[PDB]
Protein backbone atom coordinates (compact mmCIF):
# COMPACT_ATOMS: atom_id res chain seq x y z
CA UNK A 1 0.00 0.00 0.00
CA UNK A 2 0.72 3.74 -0.18
CA UNK A 3 0.34 6.01 -3.33
CA UNK A 4 2.93 7.93 -5.32
CA UNK A 5 3.24 10.14 -7.77
CA UNK A 6 5.73 7.87 -9.40
CA UNK A 7 7.70 8.23 -12.47
CA UNK A 8 9.02 5.27 -14.94
CA UNK A 9 12.44 3.90 -14.41
CA UNK A 10 14.57 7.00 -16.65
CA UNK A 11 17.44 4.30 -17.14
CA UNK A 12 16.36 3.44 -21.15
CA UNK A 13 15.93 7.31 -21.70
CA UNK A 14 19.04 7.99 -19.83
CA UNK A 15 21.22 6.08 -22.46
CA UNK A 16 20.02 7.93 -25.47
CA UNK A 17 20.71 11.47 -24.12
CA UNK A 18 23.36 13.53 -25.94
CA UNK A 19 24.47 17.17 -25.74
CA UNK A 20 23.66 19.24 -28.88
CA UNK A 21 25.54 22.35 -29.72
CA UNK A 22 25.39 24.41 -32.78
CA UNK A 23 26.83 27.92 -32.69
CA UNK A 24 26.97 29.26 -29.22
CA UNK A 25 23.69 27.42 -27.91
CA UNK A 26 23.49 23.99 -26.88
CA UNK A 27 20.67 21.93 -25.42
CA UNK A 28 19.61 17.81 -25.21
CA UNK A 29 19.42 15.49 -27.96
CA UNK A 30 17.76 12.33 -28.14
CA UNK A 31 20.05 9.30 -30.08
CA UNK A 32 18.08 6.76 -31.44
CA UNK A 33 19.92 4.60 -34.12
CA UNK A 34 21.66 6.51 -36.21
CA UNK A 35 19.36 9.67 -35.27
CA UNK A 36 19.89 12.54 -33.18
CA UNK A 37 16.65 14.59 -32.47
CA UNK A 38 16.57 17.95 -30.98
CA UNK A 39 14.84 20.99 -31.17
CA UNK A 40 14.99 23.39 -34.30
CA UNK A 41 15.96 26.52 -32.10
CA UNK A 42 19.45 25.46 -31.31
CA UNK A 43 20.49 27.07 -34.66
CA UNK A 44 19.15 30.44 -32.69
CA UNK A 45 21.31 32.80 -31.24
CA UNK A 46 18.98 35.23 -28.89
CA UNK A 47 18.08 37.82 -31.15
CA UNK A 48 17.10 35.30 -33.64
CA UNK A 49 14.30 33.82 -30.91
CA UNK A 50 12.44 36.98 -31.47
CA UNK A 51 11.08 36.09 -34.90
CA UNK A 52 13.24 33.48 -36.48
CA UNK A 53 13.05 32.24 -39.97
CA UNK A 54 13.88 28.59 -39.20
CA UNK A 55 14.48 27.95 -43.10
CA UNK A 56 16.91 30.81 -43.52
CA UNK A 57 18.54 30.17 -40.40
CA UNK A 58 19.16 25.99 -41.16
CA UNK A 59 20.23 27.38 -44.48
CA UNK A 60 23.73 28.75 -43.54
CA UNK A 61 24.25 25.76 -41.22
CA UNK A 62 26.51 22.80 -42.40
CA UNK A 63 26.30 18.88 -40.77
CA UNK A 64 30.15 20.03 -39.20
CA UNK A 65 28.40 22.79 -37.54
CA UNK A 66 26.01 20.62 -34.89
CA UNK A 67 28.43 18.97 -32.68
CA UNK A 68 26.95 15.98 -31.10
CA UNK A 69 28.61 14.54 -27.62
CA UNK A 70 27.86 11.48 -25.79
CA UNK A 71 28.71 11.55 -22.48
CA UNK A 72 32.67 12.32 -23.42
CA UNK A 73 32.81 11.02 -26.96
CA UNK A 74 31.82 12.77 -30.28
CA UNK A 75 28.96 11.93 -32.66
CA UNK A 76 29.96 12.56 -36.50
CA UNK A 77 27.15 14.12 -37.87
CA UNK A 78 26.53 12.96 -41.79
CA UNK A 79 22.82 14.67 -42.45
CA UNK A 80 20.15 17.16 -41.18
CA UNK A 81 17.09 17.87 -41.77
CA UNK A 82 14.08 19.70 -40.12
CA UNK A 83 10.92 18.39 -39.33
CA UNK A 84 8.29 20.77 -37.81
CA UNK A 85 9.88 22.17 -35.08
CA UNK A 86 12.72 19.07 -34.77
CA UNK A 87 16.04 18.79 -36.22
CA UNK A 88 17.17 14.92 -37.42
CA UNK A 89 20.76 14.72 -37.20
CA UNK A 90 22.00 11.72 -38.82
CA UNK A 91 25.00 10.27 -37.24
CA UNK A 92 27.39 7.73 -38.64
CA UNK A 93 27.00 5.64 -35.64
CA UNK A 94 24.15 3.56 -33.65
CA UNK A 95 23.44 4.64 -30.39
CA UNK A 96 24.29 1.23 -28.61
CA UNK A 97 22.20 2.33 -25.59
CA UNK A 98 18.93 2.56 -28.16
CA UNK A 99 15.97 0.47 -26.20
CA UNK A 100 12.71 -0.91 -28.17
CA UNK A 101 11.11 2.60 -29.17
CA UNK A 102 8.10 4.09 -30.43
CA UNK A 103 7.36 7.66 -31.19
CA UNK A 104 3.45 8.61 -30.15
CA UNK A 105 1.80 11.74 -29.89
CA UNK A 106 -0.51 11.68 -26.29
CA UNK A 107 -3.65 13.37 -25.71
CA UNK A 108 -4.25 16.01 -23.26
CA UNK A 109 -4.73 14.24 -19.81
CA UNK A 110 -2.74 11.36 -19.98
CA UNK A 111 0.26 11.21 -18.12
CA UNK A 112 4.02 10.65 -18.42
CA UNK A 113 7.89 10.97 -17.11
CA UNK A 114 9.89 13.96 -17.87
CA UNK A 115 13.51 13.43 -17.77
CA UNK A 116 15.28 16.79 -16.89
CA UNK A 117 18.23 17.32 -18.83
CA UNK A 118 21.09 19.43 -18.86
CA UNK A 119 24.28 19.67 -20.75
CA UNK A 120 23.14 16.53 -22.15
CA UNK A 121 23.25 15.27 -18.79
CA UNK A 122 20.13 13.70 -16.63
CA UNK A 123 19.18 15.42 -13.66
CA UNK A 124 16.07 14.18 -12.44
CA UNK A 125 12.99 12.53 -13.25
CA UNK A 126 9.50 13.24 -12.95
CA UNK A 127 5.33 12.61 -13.61
CA UNK A 128 3.42 14.89 -14.95
CA UNK A 129 0.02 15.24 -17.16
CA UNK A 130 -0.65 16.79 -20.30
CA UNK A 131 -3.02 20.17 -19.45
CA UNK A 132 -6.47 19.74 -21.13
CA UNK A 133 -4.62 23.08 -22.39
CA UNK A 134 -1.34 20.82 -23.96
CA UNK A 135 1.09 23.23 -21.88
CA UNK A 136 2.88 20.89 -18.85
CA UNK A 137 3.79 22.48 -15.50
CA UNK A 138 7.41 21.14 -15.37
CA UNK A 139 10.46 21.91 -13.86
CA UNK A 140 12.78 23.34 -16.61
CA UNK A 141 15.52 25.88 -16.61
CA UNK A 142 17.53 27.44 -19.16
CA UNK A 143 19.55 24.08 -20.92
CA UNK A 144 17.01 22.20 -21.02
CA UNK A 145 15.64 22.52 -23.89
CA UNK A 146 15.81 18.66 -25.24
CA UNK A 147 14.57 17.26 -22.63
CA UNK A 148 11.84 14.48 -23.69
CA UNK A 149 8.91 13.23 -21.81
CA UNK A 150 7.57 9.04 -22.29
CA UNK A 151 5.95 6.03 -21.11
CA UNK A 152 7.35 2.63 -20.60
CA UNK A 153 5.75 -0.63 -21.20
CA UNK A 154 7.64 -3.70 -20.22
CA UNK A 155 10.76 -2.61 -22.68
CA UNK A 156 9.25 -0.52 -25.00
CA UNK A 157 9.46 3.16 -24.47
CA UNK A 158 6.93 5.68 -26.23
CA UNK A 159 8.53 8.88 -26.47
CA UNK A 160 5.56 11.56 -26.60
CA UNK A 161 7.21 14.68 -25.57
CA UNK A 162 9.87 16.74 -26.52
CA UNK A 163 10.77 20.22 -24.33
CA UNK A 164 10.77 23.63 -26.19
CA UNK A 165 9.75 26.86 -24.55
CA UNK A 166 8.64 28.48 -21.56
CA UNK A 167 6.16 30.41 -21.65
CA UNK A 168 5.80 33.89 -19.93
CA UNK A 169 3.55 32.09 -17.25
CA UNK A 170 6.32 30.17 -16.51
CA UNK A 171 4.10 26.74 -18.03
CA UNK A 172 5.83 24.43 -20.63
CA UNK A 173 5.20 23.94 -24.02
CA UNK A 174 6.90 21.16 -26.57
CA UNK A 175 5.99 19.11 -29.37
CA UNK A 176 6.38 15.14 -30.04
CA UNK A 177 9.01 13.67 -31.41
CA UNK A 178 7.84 14.40 -35.23
CA UNK A 179 8.07 17.84 -34.08
CA UNK A 180 4.91 18.91 -33.70
CA UNK A 181 4.08 21.28 -31.00
CA UNK A 182 1.02 20.08 -28.52
CA UNK A 183 -1.24 23.11 -28.46
CA UNK A 184 -1.34 26.45 -31.04
CA UNK A 185 2.37 27.48 -29.41
CA UNK A 186 5.16 28.18 -32.37
CA UNK A 187 8.87 28.04 -31.24
CA UNK A 188 9.59 32.29 -31.06
CA UNK A 189 10.06 34.33 -28.42
CA UNK A 190 7.02 35.99 -28.37
CA UNK A 191 3.65 36.31 -25.64
CA UNK A 192 1.58 33.50 -26.08
CA UNK A 193 -1.72 32.28 -24.72
CA UNK A 194 -2.44 28.69 -23.36
CA UNK A 195 -6.16 27.91 -23.43
CA UNK A 196 -8.39 27.95 -20.35
CA UNK A 197 -7.26 24.61 -18.40
CA UNK A 198 -9.69 22.60 -16.60
CA UNK A 199 -9.48 19.55 -14.39
CA UNK A 200 -8.67 16.13 -15.63
CA UNK A 201 -11.96 14.84 -13.87
CA UNK A 202 -11.33 11.14 -15.51
CA UNK A 203 -7.53 11.37 -13.01
CA UNK A 204 -9.46 12.97 -9.99
CA UNK A 205 -11.57 9.74 -10.30
CA UNK A 206 -9.03 7.44 -10.49
CA UNK A 207 -6.88 8.97 -7.73
CA UNK A 208 -10.25 8.78 -5.46
CA UNK A 209 -10.32 5.32 -6.78
CA UNK A 210 -6.37 4.81 -5.46
CA UNK A 211 -7.40 6.68 -2.42
CA UNK A 212 -10.19 3.85 -0.81
CA UNK A 213 -7.55 0.92 -1.76
CA UNK A 214 -5.37 2.50 0.24
CA UNK A 215 -7.64 3.19 3.28
CA UNK A 216 -8.49 6.85 2.70
CA UNK A 217 -11.97 6.47 2.67
CA UNK A 218 -13.84 9.28 4.42
CA UNK A 219 -14.93 11.60 1.56
CA UNK A 220 -17.34 8.40 0.00
CA UNK A 221 -20.78 9.22 1.06
CA UNK A 222 -24.79 7.80 0.81
CA UNK A 223 -25.30 9.68 -2.74
CA UNK A 224 -25.14 9.09 -5.93
CA UNK A 225 -25.49 11.03 -8.70
CA UNK A 226 -26.23 11.14 -13.04
CA UNK A 227 -23.42 12.23 -15.76
CA UNK A 228 -25.94 15.16 -16.75
CA UNK A 229 -26.20 16.20 -13.04
CA UNK A 230 -21.85 15.59 -11.97
CA UNK A 231 -21.75 17.36 -15.85
CA UNK A 232 -23.19 20.50 -14.55
CA UNK A 233 -21.23 20.57 -10.83
CA UNK A 234 -17.93 19.75 -13.52
CA UNK A 235 -18.95 22.91 -15.72
CA UNK A 236 -19.45 25.33 -12.63
CA UNK A 237 -15.82 24.48 -11.03
CA UNK A 238 -13.77 23.63 -14.65
CA UNK A 239 -13.80 20.25 -14.58
CA UNK A 240 -13.55 18.38 -18.22
CA UNK A 241 -17.07 17.36 -18.78
CA UNK A 242 -17.06 13.67 -18.17
CA UNK A 243 -18.25 11.08 -20.76
CA UNK A 244 -19.32 7.13 -20.94
CA UNK A 245 -15.76 6.43 -22.29
CA UNK A 246 -14.45 7.72 -19.32
CA UNK A 247 -16.61 6.00 -17.22
CA UNK A 248 -15.88 2.94 -18.96
CA UNK A 249 -11.84 3.15 -18.32
CA UNK A 250 -12.87 3.38 -14.31
CA UNK A 251 -14.43 0.19 -14.63
CA UNK A 252 -12.01 -2.07 -13.17
CA UNK A 253 -11.23 0.32 -10.77
CA UNK A 254 -15.17 0.42 -10.16
CA UNK A 255 -15.00 -3.42 -10.21
CA UNK A 256 -11.77 -4.12 -7.76
CA UNK A 257 -13.77 -1.52 -5.27
CA UNK A 258 -17.12 -2.41 -5.82
CA UNK A 259 -18.07 1.67 -6.26
CA UNK A 260 -20.06 2.74 -8.92
CA UNK A 261 -18.29 5.46 -11.09
CA UNK A 262 -21.95 7.90 -10.58
CA UNK A 263 -21.31 7.05 -6.91
CA UNK A 264 -18.13 7.81 -6.80
CA UNK A 265 -19.15 11.10 -8.90
CA UNK A 266 -21.47 11.79 -5.74
CA UNK A 267 -18.24 11.85 -3.57
CA UNK A 268 -16.28 14.29 -6.29
CA UNK A 269 -20.00 16.14 -6.54
CA UNK A 270 -19.63 16.67 -2.59
CA UNK A 271 -15.85 17.05 -2.66
CA UNK A 272 -16.38 20.35 -4.94
CA UNK A 273 -19.41 21.50 -3.44
CA UNK A 274 -17.83 21.40 0.22
CA UNK A 275 -13.78 21.61 0.00
CA UNK A 276 -12.02 19.00 2.18
CA UNK A 277 -12.64 21.09 5.48
CA UNK A 278 -9.16 20.61 6.45
CA UNK A 279 -8.45 16.75 5.74
CA UNK A 280 -6.12 15.46 3.22
CA UNK A 281 -6.90 12.05 0.45
CA UNK A 282 -3.54 10.45 -0.34
CA UNK A 283 -1.59 13.48 1.66
CA UNK A 284 -3.05 15.91 -0.83
CA UNK A 285 -4.85 19.01 0.44
CA UNK A 286 -6.18 19.34 -3.07
CA UNK A 287 -7.95 16.78 -6.03
CA UNK A 288 -5.27 15.63 -7.66
CA UNK A 289 -5.36 15.08 -11.57
CA UNK A 290 -2.25 14.04 -12.89
CA UNK A 291 -3.34 9.80 -11.76
CA UNK A 292 -5.01 8.33 -15.05
CA UNK A 293 -6.78 5.32 -14.63
CA UNK A 294 -3.99 2.91 -16.10
CA UNK A 295 -1.87 4.60 -13.84
CA UNK A 296 -3.69 4.11 -10.65
CA UNK A 297 -4.28 0.07 -12.04
CA UNK A 298 -0.54 -0.10 -12.74
CA UNK A 299 0.47 1.27 -9.26
CA UNK A 300 -2.09 -0.58 -7.41
CA UNK A 301 -1.39 -4.11 -8.59
CA UNK A 302 2.69 -3.98 -8.79
CA UNK A 303 3.35 -3.80 -13.16
CA UNK A 304 7.33 -3.76 -13.82
CA UNK B 1 11.24 27.67 -13.51
CA UNK B 2 8.48 25.21 -12.05
CA UNK B 3 8.99 23.13 -9.40
CA UNK B 4 8.53 19.33 -8.76
CA UNK B 5 8.99 16.68 -6.55
CA UNK B 6 11.95 15.12 -8.67
CA UNK B 7 13.61 11.86 -8.04
CA UNK B 8 17.46 11.11 -9.05
CA UNK B 9 17.94 9.31 -12.27
CA UNK B 10 17.09 5.72 -11.57
CA UNK B 11 19.60 4.24 -14.33
CA UNK B 12 22.66 3.53 -12.43
CA UNK B 13 20.34 1.14 -9.76
CA UNK B 14 18.34 -0.20 -12.51
CA UNK B 15 21.36 -1.84 -13.60
CA UNK B 16 21.96 -3.26 -10.05
CA UNK B 17 18.80 -4.99 -9.63
CA UNK B 18 18.23 -9.10 -9.12
CA UNK B 19 15.77 -11.41 -8.11
CA UNK B 20 16.43 -13.73 -4.78
CA UNK B 21 14.50 -16.50 -4.56
CA UNK B 22 15.01 -19.14 -1.08
CA UNK B 23 12.53 -21.43 -1.12
CA UNK B 24 9.30 -20.30 -1.85
CA UNK B 25 9.88 -16.58 -1.33
CA UNK B 26 11.17 -14.13 -3.91
CA UNK B 27 12.04 -10.76 -3.25
CA UNK B 28 15.01 -7.88 -4.77
CA UNK B 29 18.35 -8.02 -4.43
CA UNK B 30 21.06 -5.65 -5.20
CA UNK B 31 24.12 -6.61 -6.96
CA UNK B 32 27.28 -4.47 -6.53
CA UNK B 33 30.15 -5.49 -7.70
CA UNK B 34 30.45 -9.59 -6.21
CA UNK B 35 28.23 -9.06 -3.83
CA UNK B 36 24.00 -9.27 -3.84
CA UNK B 37 22.17 -7.73 -0.88
CA UNK B 38 18.97 -8.66 -0.10
CA UNK B 39 16.77 -8.77 3.27
CA UNK B 40 17.39 -11.44 5.40
CA UNK B 41 13.39 -12.13 5.76
CA UNK B 42 14.12 -14.05 2.36
CA UNK B 43 14.77 -17.03 4.22
CA UNK B 44 11.20 -16.72 5.96
CA UNK B 45 8.06 -18.66 5.24
CA UNK B 46 4.62 -16.92 5.83
CA UNK B 47 4.37 -18.81 9.34
CA UNK B 48 8.45 -17.91 10.48
CA UNK B 49 7.62 -14.63 10.38
CA UNK B 50 5.72 -14.56 12.90
CA UNK B 51 8.69 -14.63 15.28
CA UNK B 52 11.53 -15.59 12.82
CA UNK B 53 14.67 -16.93 14.24
CA UNK B 54 16.90 -15.85 11.93
CA UNK B 55 20.25 -17.51 12.52
CA UNK B 56 18.70 -20.61 13.22
CA UNK B 57 16.69 -20.20 9.56
CA UNK B 58 19.99 -19.14 7.87
CA UNK B 59 21.58 -22.81 9.21
CA UNK B 60 19.43 -24.77 6.98
CA UNK B 61 20.23 -23.23 4.15
CA UNK B 62 23.26 -23.37 1.59
CA UNK B 63 24.55 -21.24 -1.11
CA UNK B 64 22.93 -23.64 -3.71
CA UNK B 65 18.95 -22.27 -1.88
CA UNK B 66 19.76 -18.74 -3.02
CA UNK B 67 18.68 -18.33 -6.20
CA UNK B 68 19.69 -15.03 -7.76
CA UNK B 69 18.58 -13.59 -11.41
CA UNK B 70 19.75 -10.70 -13.07
CA UNK B 71 17.15 -10.36 -15.79
CA UNK B 72 17.47 -13.83 -17.59
CA UNK B 73 21.25 -14.54 -16.49
CA UNK B 74 21.85 -16.63 -13.63
CA UNK B 75 24.26 -15.43 -11.03
CA UNK B 76 26.35 -18.49 -8.81
CA UNK B 77 26.47 -18.24 -5.29
CA UNK B 78 29.57 -18.89 -3.72
CA UNK B 79 29.11 -17.80 -0.34
CA UNK B 80 26.24 -16.25 2.43
CA UNK B 81 26.41 -14.15 5.17
CA UNK B 82 23.83 -12.39 7.71
CA UNK B 83 24.96 -8.85 8.84
CA UNK B 84 22.16 -7.22 10.83
CA UNK B 85 18.65 -7.80 8.97
CA UNK B 86 20.32 -8.03 5.65
CA UNK B 87 21.82 -10.80 3.65
CA UNK B 88 25.22 -10.74 1.66
CA UNK B 89 25.46 -13.59 -0.87
CA UNK B 90 28.59 -13.54 -2.81
CA UNK B 91 28.28 -14.13 -6.62
CA UNK B 92 31.25 -15.20 -8.76
CA UNK B 93 30.78 -12.61 -11.30
CA UNK B 94 30.91 -8.83 -10.32
CA UNK B 95 28.27 -6.81 -11.64
CA UNK B 96 29.23 -5.32 -14.99
CA UNK B 97 27.05 -2.16 -14.49
CA UNK B 98 28.21 -1.32 -10.64
CA UNK B 99 28.60 2.38 -10.49
CA UNK B 100 30.75 3.89 -8.30
CA UNK B 101 28.81 3.81 -4.73
CA UNK B 102 28.71 3.96 -0.90
CA UNK B 103 26.87 2.97 1.52
CA UNK B 104 25.72 5.87 4.01
CA UNK B 105 22.87 5.71 6.60
CA UNK B 106 20.90 9.42 6.44
CA UNK B 107 19.42 11.42 9.26
CA UNK B 108 15.63 11.64 9.27
CA UNK B 109 14.45 14.80 7.21
CA UNK B 110 16.90 13.72 4.74
CA UNK B 111 15.51 12.79 1.57
CA UNK B 112 15.93 10.11 -1.38
CA UNK B 113 15.05 8.26 -4.79
CA UNK B 114 13.05 4.88 -4.20
CA UNK B 115 13.40 2.63 -7.78
CA UNK B 116 10.00 0.68 -6.24
CA UNK B 117 11.08 -3.52 -8.02
CA UNK B 118 9.17 -6.20 -8.14
CA UNK B 119 11.32 -9.77 -9.02
CA UNK B 120 14.25 -7.80 -9.80
CA UNK B 121 12.66 -5.46 -11.89
CA UNK B 122 12.21 -1.77 -11.84
CA UNK B 123 8.65 -0.32 -12.17
CA UNK B 124 8.54 2.98 -10.81
CA UNK B 125 10.72 5.98 -9.12
CA UNK B 126 9.69 8.31 -6.82
CA UNK B 127 11.58 10.75 -4.46
CA UNK B 128 10.73 10.73 -0.27
CA UNK B 129 12.06 12.14 3.00
CA UNK B 130 13.29 9.74 5.89
CA UNK B 131 10.03 10.74 8.69
CA UNK B 132 11.69 12.48 11.93
CA UNK B 133 10.27 9.16 13.15
CA UNK B 134 12.73 7.09 11.20
CA UNK B 135 9.59 5.47 8.72
CA UNK B 136 8.70 6.50 5.31
CA UNK B 137 5.76 7.22 2.98
CA UNK B 138 6.16 4.91 0.35
CA UNK B 139 4.35 2.97 -2.31
CA UNK B 140 5.49 -0.47 -2.26
CA UNK B 141 3.27 -3.79 -2.60
CA UNK B 142 4.08 -7.42 -1.55
CA UNK B 143 6.99 -8.29 -3.67
CA UNK B 144 9.01 -4.91 -3.40
CA UNK B 145 11.32 -5.83 -0.66
CA UNK B 146 14.67 -5.48 -1.31
CA UNK B 147 13.36 -2.24 -3.34
CA UNK B 148 16.04 0.44 -2.29
CA UNK B 149 16.53 3.98 -1.76
CA UNK B 150 19.68 6.01 -3.03
CA UNK B 151 20.99 9.60 -3.93
CA UNK B 152 23.31 10.88 -6.48
CA UNK B 153 26.67 12.51 -6.44
CA UNK B 154 27.42 13.40 -10.51
CA UNK B 155 28.84 9.56 -10.79
CA UNK B 156 28.27 8.34 -7.70
CA UNK B 157 25.68 6.28 -6.00
CA UNK B 158 24.97 6.57 -2.15
CA UNK B 159 22.45 3.90 -1.04
CA UNK B 160 20.74 4.66 2.20
CA UNK B 161 17.58 2.36 2.47
CA UNK B 162 16.53 -1.34 1.43
CA UNK B 163 13.12 -1.69 2.03
CA UNK B 164 11.92 -4.24 4.62
CA UNK B 165 8.53 -4.24 6.06
CA UNK B 166 4.96 -2.35 6.05
CA UNK B 167 3.78 -2.15 9.05
CA UNK B 168 -0.14 -2.34 10.06
CA UNK B 169 -0.75 1.41 9.52
CA UNK B 170 0.56 1.52 6.07
CA UNK B 171 3.79 3.02 6.36
CA UNK B 172 7.23 1.43 5.37
CA UNK B 173 10.43 0.26 7.14
CA UNK B 174 13.49 -0.72 6.52
CA UNK B 175 17.40 -1.07 7.19
CA UNK B 176 20.46 1.03 5.92
CA UNK B 177 22.61 -1.45 3.54
CA UNK B 178 24.25 -2.49 6.43
CA UNK B 179 21.23 -4.19 7.67
CA UNK B 180 20.44 -1.84 10.37
CA UNK B 181 16.74 -0.90 11.00
CA UNK B 182 16.10 2.99 10.37
CA UNK B 183 14.10 3.21 13.64
CA UNK B 184 12.50 0.72 16.41
CA UNK B 185 11.77 -1.25 13.90
CA UNK B 186 12.43 -5.15 14.06
CA UNK B 187 11.89 -7.63 11.41
CA UNK B 188 8.71 -9.65 12.42
CA UNK B 189 5.44 -9.87 11.91
CA UNK B 190 3.94 -8.29 15.15
CA UNK B 191 2.19 -4.92 15.77
CA UNK B 192 5.13 -2.02 16.00
CA UNK B 193 4.49 1.55 16.85
CA UNK B 194 6.17 4.11 15.10
CA UNK B 195 6.61 7.13 16.88
CA UNK B 196 4.77 10.99 16.96
CA UNK B 197 5.77 11.76 13.67
CA UNK B 198 6.73 15.93 13.08
CA UNK B 199 6.96 18.07 10.06
CA UNK B 200 10.35 18.80 8.61
CA UNK B 201 10.71 22.11 9.43
CA UNK B 202 13.82 23.13 7.57
CA UNK B 203 12.37 21.51 4.69
CA UNK B 204 8.77 23.72 4.72
CA UNK B 205 11.02 26.92 4.94
CA UNK B 206 13.35 25.23 2.02
CA UNK B 207 10.20 24.88 0.02
CA UNK B 208 8.74 28.57 0.63
CA UNK B 209 12.30 29.72 -0.53
CA UNK B 210 11.44 27.26 -3.67
CA UNK B 211 8.08 29.04 -3.84
CA UNK B 212 9.47 32.62 -3.36
CA UNK B 213 11.89 31.63 -6.30
CA UNK B 214 9.12 30.74 -8.41
CA UNK B 215 6.56 33.47 -8.21
CA UNK B 216 4.20 32.12 -5.25
CA UNK B 217 4.94 34.98 -2.79
CA UNK B 218 1.47 35.84 -1.60
CA UNK B 219 2.25 33.94 1.82
CA UNK B 220 5.47 36.69 2.55
CA UNK B 221 4.35 39.23 4.86
CA UNK B 222 5.59 42.46 6.89
CA UNK B 223 6.93 40.21 10.09
CA UNK B 224 9.35 38.75 11.80
CA UNK B 225 9.61 36.60 14.47
CA UNK B 226 12.91 34.96 16.91
CA UNK B 227 14.18 31.23 16.70
CA UNK B 228 12.35 30.95 20.43
CA UNK B 229 9.07 32.27 19.47
CA UNK B 230 8.93 30.27 16.17
CA UNK B 231 9.62 27.51 18.00
CA UNK B 232 6.72 27.95 20.97
CA UNK B 233 4.45 28.09 17.85
CA UNK B 234 6.25 24.28 16.15
CA UNK B 235 5.48 22.85 19.46
CA UNK B 236 2.00 23.73 19.20
CA UNK B 237 1.67 22.38 15.51
CA UNK B 238 4.01 19.36 15.76
CA UNK B 239 7.10 20.70 13.60
CA UNK B 240 10.44 19.97 14.31
CA UNK B 241 12.29 23.11 16.80
CA UNK B 242 14.23 25.04 14.40
CA UNK B 243 18.15 25.14 15.23
CA UNK B 244 20.91 27.67 14.49
CA UNK B 245 22.29 24.69 12.27
CA UNK B 246 19.13 25.01 10.01
CA UNK B 247 19.04 28.33 9.44
CA UNK B 248 22.58 27.78 8.54
CA UNK B 249 21.99 25.86 6.03
CA UNK B 250 19.00 27.84 5.02
CA UNK B 251 21.65 30.64 4.34
CA UNK B 252 21.93 30.32 0.77
CA UNK B 253 18.29 30.40 -0.27
CA UNK B 254 18.64 33.29 1.76
CA UNK B 255 20.85 35.05 -0.32
CA UNK B 256 19.47 33.98 -3.26
CA UNK B 257 16.19 35.84 -2.68
CA UNK B 258 17.01 38.31 0.13
CA UNK B 259 14.55 37.41 2.63
CA UNK B 260 16.37 36.76 6.15
CA UNK B 261 15.10 32.92 7.53
CA UNK B 262 13.90 34.35 10.57
CA UNK B 263 11.15 36.50 8.32
CA UNK B 264 10.65 33.42 6.26
CA UNK B 265 9.47 31.68 9.44
CA UNK B 266 7.29 34.89 10.39
CA UNK B 267 5.67 33.68 7.18
CA UNK B 268 5.56 30.34 8.19
CA UNK B 269 4.15 30.80 11.44
CA UNK B 270 0.66 32.74 9.97
CA UNK B 271 0.99 30.09 7.74
CA UNK B 272 0.41 27.65 10.44
CA UNK B 273 -1.90 29.93 12.23
CA UNK B 274 -4.30 30.82 9.50
CA UNK B 275 -4.01 28.20 7.02
CA UNK B 276 -3.91 28.79 3.33
CA UNK B 277 -7.07 30.29 2.92
CA UNK B 278 -7.69 28.04 0.49
CA UNK B 279 -5.08 29.45 -1.91
CA UNK B 280 -2.02 27.15 -3.05
CA UNK B 281 2.15 27.68 -3.04
CA UNK B 282 3.25 25.67 -6.22
CA UNK B 283 0.57 23.66 -6.73
CA UNK B 284 0.02 21.97 -3.20
CA UNK B 285 -2.23 22.61 -0.64
CA UNK B 286 -0.61 21.94 2.57
CA UNK B 287 2.93 23.31 4.11
CA UNK B 288 5.53 20.68 1.75
CA UNK B 289 8.19 19.10 3.96
CA UNK B 290 10.08 16.34 1.47
CA UNK B 291 12.63 19.02 -0.27
CA UNK B 292 15.50 20.05 1.69
CA UNK B 293 17.46 23.12 1.57
CA UNK B 294 20.18 21.07 -0.71
CA UNK B 295 17.69 19.91 -2.86
CA UNK B 296 15.84 23.12 -3.64
CA UNK B 297 19.48 24.58 -4.43
CA UNK B 298 20.24 21.52 -6.97
CA UNK B 299 16.86 22.09 -8.22
CA UNK B 300 16.57 25.81 -8.63
CA UNK B 301 20.58 26.24 -10.00
CA UNK B 302 20.17 22.94 -12.63
CA UNK B 303 22.81 20.31 -11.45
CA UNK B 304 23.23 16.90 -13.80
C1 LIG C 1 15.98 29.68 -25.87
C2 LIG C 1 15.01 28.86 -25.04
C3 LIG C 1 13.73 29.64 -24.68
C4 LIG C 1 12.89 29.00 -23.57
O1 LIG C 1 11.74 29.36 -23.35
N1 LIG C 1 13.49 28.01 -22.88
C5 LIG C 1 13.53 27.58 -21.54
C6 LIG C 1 12.98 26.34 -21.24
N2 LIG C 1 12.58 25.98 -20.04
N3 LIG C 1 12.74 26.83 -19.00
C7 LIG C 1 13.29 28.04 -19.20
C8 LIG C 1 13.71 28.47 -20.46
C9 LIG C 1 14.43 29.79 -20.61
C10 LIG C 1 12.84 29.87 -25.89
C11 LIG C 1 12.33 31.13 -26.17
C12 LIG C 1 11.36 31.30 -27.15
C13 LIG C 1 10.90 30.21 -27.87
C14 LIG C 1 11.46 28.97 -27.63
CL1 LIG C 1 11.00 27.62 -28.62
C15 LIG C 1 12.41 28.79 -26.65
C1 LIG D 1 6.94 -10.71 3.97
C2 LIG D 1 6.99 -9.21 3.80
C3 LIG D 1 6.22 -8.46 4.89
C4 LIG D 1 5.94 -6.99 4.57
O1 LIG D 1 5.56 -6.20 5.43
N1 LIG D 1 6.17 -6.61 3.29
C5 LIG D 1 5.55 -5.75 2.36
C6 LIG D 1 6.27 -4.63 1.94
N2 LIG D 1 5.72 -3.56 1.42
N3 LIG D 1 4.37 -3.53 1.21
C7 LIG D 1 3.62 -4.59 1.55
C8 LIG D 1 4.16 -5.74 2.13
C9 LIG D 1 3.29 -6.94 2.39
C10 LIG D 1 6.90 -8.54 6.24
C11 LIG D 1 6.20 -8.89 7.39
C12 LIG D 1 6.78 -8.76 8.64
C13 LIG D 1 8.08 -8.30 8.77
C14 LIG D 1 8.79 -8.01 7.62
CL1 LIG D 1 10.46 -7.57 7.76
C15 LIG D 1 8.22 -8.12 6.37
Chains 1, 2 share one sequence.
Not at 115 to 143: D, E, H, W
Request: aromatic letters at 10%; glycine letters at 8%; one cysteine or more.
Amino acid sequence: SGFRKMAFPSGKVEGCMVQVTCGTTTLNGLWLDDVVYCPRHVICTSEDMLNPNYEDLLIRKSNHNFLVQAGNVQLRVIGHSMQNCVLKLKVDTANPKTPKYKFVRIQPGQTFSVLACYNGSPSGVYQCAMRPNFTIKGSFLNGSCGSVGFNIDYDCVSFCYMHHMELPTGVHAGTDLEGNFYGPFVDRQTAQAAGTDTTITVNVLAWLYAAVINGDRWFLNRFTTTLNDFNLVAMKYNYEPLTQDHVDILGPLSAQTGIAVLDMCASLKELLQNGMNGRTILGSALLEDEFTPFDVVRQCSGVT
